Amino acid sequence: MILDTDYITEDGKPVIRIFKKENGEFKIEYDRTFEPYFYALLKDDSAIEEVKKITAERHGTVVTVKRVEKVQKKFLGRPVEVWKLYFTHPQDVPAIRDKIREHPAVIDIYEYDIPFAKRYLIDKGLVPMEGDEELKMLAFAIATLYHEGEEFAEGPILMISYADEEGARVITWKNVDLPYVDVVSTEREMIKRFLRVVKEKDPDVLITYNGDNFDFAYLKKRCEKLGINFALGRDGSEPKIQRMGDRFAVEVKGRIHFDLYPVIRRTINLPTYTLEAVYEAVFGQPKEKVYAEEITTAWETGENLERVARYSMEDAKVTYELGKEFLPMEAQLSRLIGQSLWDVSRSSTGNLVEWFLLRKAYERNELAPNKPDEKELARRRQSYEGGYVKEPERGLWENIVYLDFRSLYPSIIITHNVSPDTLNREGCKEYDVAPQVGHRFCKDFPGFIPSLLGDLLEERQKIKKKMKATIDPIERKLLDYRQRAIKILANSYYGYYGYARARWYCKECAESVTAWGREYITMTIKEIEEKYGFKVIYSDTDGFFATIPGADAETVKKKAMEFLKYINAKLPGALELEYEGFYKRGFFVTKKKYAVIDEEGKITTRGLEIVRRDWSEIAKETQARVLEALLKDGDVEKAVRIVKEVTEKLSKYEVPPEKLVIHEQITRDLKDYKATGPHVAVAKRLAARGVKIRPGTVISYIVLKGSGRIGDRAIPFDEFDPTKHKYDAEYYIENQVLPAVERILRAFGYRKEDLR
DNA sequence: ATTCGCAGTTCGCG
DNA sequence: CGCGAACTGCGA
Ligand SMILES: [Mg+2]
């Protein structure tokens, strides 16, 4: 199968390299015949002779147009003629494309910012990660000597650990009495030993945790300091470092550097993304943290080095375990989008859709629109109305059914053919008209995006049912991941429509989807109220909670099923209302905030403090305890005692500090903040010292007993010391626990002073 | 560098 | 003092 592609230059000419793994054998294929190109729209065909002679210069070398040819393509449905301009080397394109655009007779240029290697995959119809080839993977991690006021990588690497199917080992240059530790003489020897391991194991995938922004950078500075050729690549090359906006990314030629950090960041939602928290949430098993201070202290005193080595070992071990858990899913996502695992695992929603569309556009001879320039970008800051949210009838309800649409937004796009190439298209014999916004969509032919979206949803269903019949457990897992990958991509189309940087951006399409959605959800609600006598307790966008307050559980279920039969006969196209679940009880606090419990006793919570990371565990824990007492036991006076118990424990300082940590994300550069909240205050004190802060950093702090604002009393939890610090019991009672619980017990008539 | 709608806290202004 | 901007993270 295909892992990746790139190009090298030989005698001034680009040579594509295709990196493959066939039958457990690494292979490189070379292609010297692929020509870089982009398109130009001319107002006059005669102008082509002027464009041929346009020249530029890269670095002394003179850039010219190799050859041209007129081609006929489609642009948003309508037919168009443009000139395909070829060049000798892909680096000629960025050097001359501006000179060609600025030419008077050139209306516009297209597809001029597509990387050569990616252009090759699309044009040749090649799909990475296709097949059942098993990749050999290796995880690794490092431990370092940290001192507070030093430069990056001023301290040596203390240990390098790695892990695969054979287990986990640690390389270090001090004597450690553990069976999985290999001892060498120096840091230099340790690094060289690691090179040999990678060379001999020859893994297809190198797995790290935050290796893009720490590990490889640290190794690089150290190899420079020690004079080592850090040749990790299968071609003898050193890791290549690239700039991805305000962050970094690292390739290793011939293999795939799989950094788990950006992947897990997108896949699951956690309060913090430390390696310990991630592992404990995914595998449900604890992992002890050993801090930089303890590591430094252990290395200098020579004392607890076993503890450090074990931590180093577990880092590599869990990294390998997590890599095994997340990689196959990302691999199937890569195959779907049609780009390398390296790019896909580091790409967000916007880029993934765009690359998929770019490939499909080529297959359909569809000329792709350009990225918006700064002027057009500012013109796309106009917003639109979103989903409908009913104000809930607040309180505790009995025997509730939840009904919702199966894929509401994708169903709308397919059913009503919503697409920029069908928008207000004149000359058609059939149209659908969006409510409120009034946009018309041609129904005569499948639109580009609804066509692709329809194939995706259809393919997904064919995979779901083939899974049930697939005996081979490995094939079933593969199909499961592809099916999940399709769901992710299919649900990304709507948001992409309203994404201002998108090539196929269309605000009219985006607001038409939401307008139609508001219509269908509101029609369905008044339908079940008027014709079946249900009370609709609450509704958000694509579903609602309903019940008959004076009815039996089986009575509610029966009537709900009858309603479903009724409205589904009225719904057009692919729209379908479904029976999502029945709930014994439910408590609806506000819009976006509620909790329900099924007949098994399982509680599901939305929006409440319990779900959020910017609330201490102590507040979330008793809110969950209160909610359980109400939903499962129906015991309101028990919920009260629990709060009295918790506030008393807090006031007497019997609560562990670990359950008092508050987590809050830094979203921008610290200088760009206008209002300084507690987490920003803590961040600025950190940045004042050694530690640098990036947008995406989660600040974990605790509030201390003292004077001043909350931000003046807040410190990072790592630095909390019982001998130096005392947490603010009053704060965690009056600002954390009580507000979170009072908002629930308010409905029963309890004040804050009813619980102290 | 996917969308909009919404509850809630901290802090500073008048 | 009330009040609103700034800010975060959630639901769909
Ligand atoms: Mg709103």
Q: Single out the residue in A347, A378, A399 at which a domain terminates.
A: A347
Inter-residue contact A624 to A609 (CB < 8 Å): no
Do A426 and A509 reside in the same domain of the chain? yes
CB-based burial label for A68 (10 Å; 0-12, 13-18, 19+): middle
Ligand 1 centroid to Cα of residue A546, in Å, is 23
Do A574 and A440 reside in the same domain of the chain? yes
Local structure of A186: helix, strand or coil: coil
Residues 6+ apart with CB under 8 A from A25: none
In the sheet that holds A603-606, the strands lie side by side as A535-539, A543-547, A395-405, A577-590, A593-597, A603-606
Going A209 to A210 to A212 to A217, the CA torsion angle's sign is: negative
Within residues 232-271 of protein chain A, the ones with CB less than 7 A from nucleic strand C are 269, 271
* Closest nucleotide to A703 by C1' from CA: B10
Q: Single out the residue in A585, A612, A646 at which a domain terminates.
A: A585
A754 touches strand C (CB under 7 A): no
Q: Which tokens go with A210?
A: 């935050």
DSSP of A465-523, one letter per residue? HHHHH---HHHHHHHHHHHHHHHHHHTTHHHHHT-TT-TT--HHHHHHHHHHHHHHHHH
* Closest nucleotide to A676 by C1' from CA: B11
Q: To what resolution in angstroms was this structure determined? A: 2.3
Q: Single out the residue in A429, A464, A499 at which a domain terminates.
A: A499
Block residue for tokens 């892992």: A3
* Closest nucleotide to A695 by C1' from CA: B1
Bridge partners (DSSP) listed for residue A70: A83
**Alpha-carbon distance A436 to A26, whole Å?**
58
Do A360 and A476 reside in the same domain of the chain? no
Local structure of A695: helix, strand or coil: coil
- Going by C-alpha positions, the residue among A273, A303, A140, A291 that lies closest to residue A216 is A140
- Going by C-alpha positions, the residue among A591, A552, A572 that lies closest to residue A443 is A572
**Alpha-carbon distance A244 to A212, whole Å?**
10
Bridge partners (DSSP) listed for residue A48: none
The separation, in Å, between residue A675 CA and nucleotide B14 C1' comes to 18
**How far is residue A168 from each of residues A61, A164, A209, A309, measured CA to CA in Å?**
51, 7, 15, 11
Inter-residue contact A370 to A108 (CB < 8 Å): yes
CATH number of residue A204's parent domain: 3.30.420.10
The neighbour count for residue A141, using CB atoms within 10 Å, is 29
**Paired sense of beta strands A167-172 and A181-183, if any:** parallel
Inter-residue contact A325 to A258 (CB < 8 Å): no
Do A230 and A295 reside in the same domain of the chain? yes
Do A666 and A538 reside in the same domain of the chain? no
Do A385 and A355 reside in the same domain of the chain? no
Q: What share of chain A is helix, strand, coil (3-state, %, to 5)?
A: 40, 25, 35
The separation, in Å, between residue A609 CA and nucleotide C10 C1' comes to 10
Do A648 and A695 reside in the same domain of the chain? yes
DSSP of A575-595, one letter per residue? --EEEEEEEEEEEEEETTEEE
Distance of CA A29 to the CA centre of its chain: 33
Do A744 and A606 reside in the same domain of the chain? yes
Instruction: Identify residue A419 by its one-letter amino acid code.
Output: S
Do A39 and A113 reside in the same domain of the chain? yes
**How far is residue A12 from each of residues A32, A89, A97, A354, measured CA to CA in Å?**
11, 7, 19, 31
* Closest nucleotide to A736 by C1' from CA: B9
Inter-residue contact A418 to A393 (CB < 8 Å): no
Going A319 to A322 to A328 to A330, the CA torsion angle's sign is: negative
Do A387 and A464 reside in the same domain of the chain? no
**Paired sense of beta strands A662-665 and A698-703, if any:** antiparallel
Do A172 and A283 reside in the same domain of the chain? yes
A677 touches strand C (CB under 7 A): yes
* Closest nucleotide to A668 by C1' from CA: C7
Residues 6+ apart with CB under 8 A from A283: A318, A321
Do A392 and A278 reside in the same domain of the chain? no
* Strand B nucleotides within a 7 Å radius of protein CB atoms: 1-12
**How far is residue A720 from each of residues A366, A554, A716, measured CA to CA in Å?**
60, 54, 7
Residues 6+ apart with CB under 8 A from A512: A416, A418, A434, A437, A439, A441
- For residue A364, which phi and psi values (nearest 5 degrees)? -105, 10
Residue with CA nearest B9 C1'?
Answer: A735
Number of domains in chain A: 5
Which structural domain, as residue segments, surrounds residue A604?
Answer: 586-756
Task: With residue A140 as reference, give the H or E element that holds it.
Answer: strand A137-144
- Going by C-alpha positions, the residue among A235, A275, A276 that lies closest to residue A255 is A235
- Going by C-alpha positions, the residue among A38, A20, A39 that lies closest to residue A29 is A20
Residues 6+ apart with CB under 8 A from A754: A640, A745
Task: With residue A699 as reference, give the H or E element that holds it.
Answer: strand A698-703
**Alpha-carbon distance A548 to A537, whole Å?**
10
Q: Which tokens go with A162?
A: 């790695």
**Alpha-carbon distance A338 to A485, whole Å?**
12
The neighbour count for residue A200, using CB atoms within 10 Å, is 7
Residues 6+ apart with CB under 8 A from A144: A153, A155, A156, A157, A158, A218, A292, A295
CATH number of residue A544's parent domain: 3.90.1600.10
Q: Which tokens go with A156?
A: 């040596």
Inter-residue contact A174 to A298 (CB < 8 Å): no
Cα-based angle A509, A515, A518 (whole degrees, multiple of 5): 145
Task: With residue A401 as reference, give the H or E element that holds it.
Answer: strand A395-405
Residue with CA nearest B10 C1'?
Answer: A677
Q: How was this structure determined?
A: X-ray
